[PDB]
Amino acid sequence: QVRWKIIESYNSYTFIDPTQLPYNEKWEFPRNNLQFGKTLGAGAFGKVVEATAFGLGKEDAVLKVAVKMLKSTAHADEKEALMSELKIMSHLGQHENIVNLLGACTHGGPVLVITEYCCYGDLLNFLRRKSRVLETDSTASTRDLLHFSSQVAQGMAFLASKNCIHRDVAARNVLLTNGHVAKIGDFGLARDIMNDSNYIVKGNARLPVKWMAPESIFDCVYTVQSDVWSYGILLWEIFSLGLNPYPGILVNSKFYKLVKDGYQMAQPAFAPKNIYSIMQACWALEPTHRPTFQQICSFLQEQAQEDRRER
Numbered sequence: 490q491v492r493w494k495i496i497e498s499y500n501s502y503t504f505i506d507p508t509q510l511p512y513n514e515k516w517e518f519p520r521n522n523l524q525f526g527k528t529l530g531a532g533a534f535g536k537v538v539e540a541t542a543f544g545l546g547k548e549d550a551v552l553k554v555a556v557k558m559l560k561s562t563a564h565a566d567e568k569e570a571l572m573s574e575l576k577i578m579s580h581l582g583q584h585e586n587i588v589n590l591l592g593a594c595t596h597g598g599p600v601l602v603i604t605e606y607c608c609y610g611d612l613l614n615f616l617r618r619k620s621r622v623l624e625t626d627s628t629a630s631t632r633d634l635l636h637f638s639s640q641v642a643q644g645m646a647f648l649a650s651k652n653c654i655h656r657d658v659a660a661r662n663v664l665l666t667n668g669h670v671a672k673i674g675d676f677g678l679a680r681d682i683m684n685d686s687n688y689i690v691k692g693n694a695r696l697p698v699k700w701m702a703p704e705s706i707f708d709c710v711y712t713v714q715s716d717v718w719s720y721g722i723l724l725w726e727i728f729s730l731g732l733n734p735y736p737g738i739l740v741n742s743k744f745y746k747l748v749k750d751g752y753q754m755a756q757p758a759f760a761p762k763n764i765y766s767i768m769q770a771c772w773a774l775e776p777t778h779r780p781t782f783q784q785i786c787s788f789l790q791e792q793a794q795e796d797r798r799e800r
């Protein structure tokens with residue numbers, strides 16, 4: 490699969506899986522006080538649209554928001570997934586680098602999940618635009634790339650503390666909001682996975698193989714340490730300004746043997762040695778030897794301090 494999921498563990502402790510048990514009427518919002526705007530993006534089962542929420546939250550501010558919903562294509566299994574996402578997001582609590590849940594409309598019509606809106610779009614395209622610009626005729630700095638890396642590492646650290654796995658860590662799934670601050674969220678339902686060649690067919694599913702840890706690919710094992718590997722690939726995308734992972738290499742038998750054998754992409758053009766060390770660490774074949782997101786956060790902080798010390 491490729492959706493957020495609370496797993497069982499006991500640093501962090503799983504007292505309960507929000508998925509089981511019905512939903513908390515604690516997030517209900519007036520389906521009327523919502524004016525649908527432009528369609529931010531759409532997928533196979535649903536879509537997410539921009540909108541204005543009148544009187545949302547304590548501060549009755551009329552802030553801009555994003556609204557996810559299903560399509561005709563969505564059946565039962567599809568409806569459950571949306572409710573489950575809702576249940577997970579209502580249980581995770583808020584964080585500055587997560588696309589936070591703001592409300593929902595589960596009565597008097599189709600289910601609508603309201604979350605924060607990210608005015609600048611996804612990171613991958615932001616990166617690709619700057620790089621294209623590099624062949625000059627706003628210019629990202631090492632600090633800029635470090636911040637993106639930190640913000641995401643912080644979001645992932647938060648998820649990990651809640652025993653929540655992401656499963657689709659990639660630059661395409663990193664959004665940029667005010668101040669160009671990065672945020673992560675479950676965007677599967679609005680992801681056109683069936684027609685995105687980055688998602689390889691595995692019979693009963695479509696998986697982002699180039700971003701997946703070996704154990705997840707070969708043993709269907711998904712843990713927080715699997716997400717760490719994926720984060721390593723994300724770092725490579727960030728510091729190469731958006732090149733596709735394993736450039737020119739197709740996903741087939743050869744590929745699997747390569748990753749299985751310990752093959753690792755080369756250091757990206759804009760990554761300092763220290764940052765490539767993070768990538769290499771994240772790509773340890775043995776999950777237990779990979780760093781935790783907090784360890785990544787603290788190391789990244791050190792790189793930001795030294796960079797500043799340098800000015």
Ligand SMILES: CC1CCN(c2ccc(CO)cc2NC(=O)c2ccc(C#N)o2)CC1
Pocket residue numbers: 529530531537555557588604605606607608609610611664674675676677679680
């Ligand atoms: C899968 C894609 C994720 C990013 N995407 C946006 C594109 C551009 C902009 C800037 O106008 C914003 C986007 N999205 C959000 O702000 C947002 C909040 C929650 C979700 C969900 N799902 O998408 C379209 C769908």
